Amino acid sequence: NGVELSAVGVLLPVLMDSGRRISGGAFMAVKGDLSEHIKNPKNTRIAQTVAGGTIYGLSEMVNIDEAEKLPIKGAITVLPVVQATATSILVPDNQPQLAFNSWEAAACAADTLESQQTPFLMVTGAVESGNLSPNLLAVQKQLLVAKPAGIGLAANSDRALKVVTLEQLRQVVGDKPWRKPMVTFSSGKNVAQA
Numbered sequence: 001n002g003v004e005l006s007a008v009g010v011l012l013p014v015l016m017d018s019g020r021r022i023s024g025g026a027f028m029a030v031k032g033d034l035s036e037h038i039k040n041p042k043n044t045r046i047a048q049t050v051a052g053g054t055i056y057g058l059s060e061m062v063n064i065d066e067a068e069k070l071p072i073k074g075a076i077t078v079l080p081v082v083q084a085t086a087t088s089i090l091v092p093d094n095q096p097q098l099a100f101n102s103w104e105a106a107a108c109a110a111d112t113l114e115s116q117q118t119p120f121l122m123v124t125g126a127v128e129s130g131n132l133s134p135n136l137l138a139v140q141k142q143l144l145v146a147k148p149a150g151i152g153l154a155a156n157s158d159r160a161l162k163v164v165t166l167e168q169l170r171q172v173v174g175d176k177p178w179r180k181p182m183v184t185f186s187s188g189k190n191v192a193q194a
């Protein structure tokens, strides 16, 4: 069970531990307030940012202080997705708890996305003072999410499409046409580490 929504935003890879195997999935930092589609009662924390923005879909396992320093001016909801196209997503009813801060580069890029289409590119990394932090898990996100889904990944890492500043990330998400109609991802019920 899930809901298909018209939506524009920026995809981000997540990893999930089921004690035996690490698997991969995706969330999207979606533009707008979509908090009515949050179905995990742990992901019920909201971050209001210094720039006037509001981010929904967060849990206690996210560093909220770092989320509140993001240069996001509008509403962003981070939702799990099992399918995405240029203009829609499919949000599963079974939703994992979102943890950590690697969704921030996508949420910043989704906030200043002016194109009206989601870029065909996934983005990972935490944001601190207009820069992407150094990356830890791009290689594992490549292996478990982006490469099997057939889509590029941007990260502060030379094993991704490399971006260091929020300004560079904005340029890179601006022109990413869809090389196929849809990407799909596995879902999990286990904590999603973004």
Ligand SMILES: [Cl-]
Pocket: none
């Ligand atoms: Cl370099």
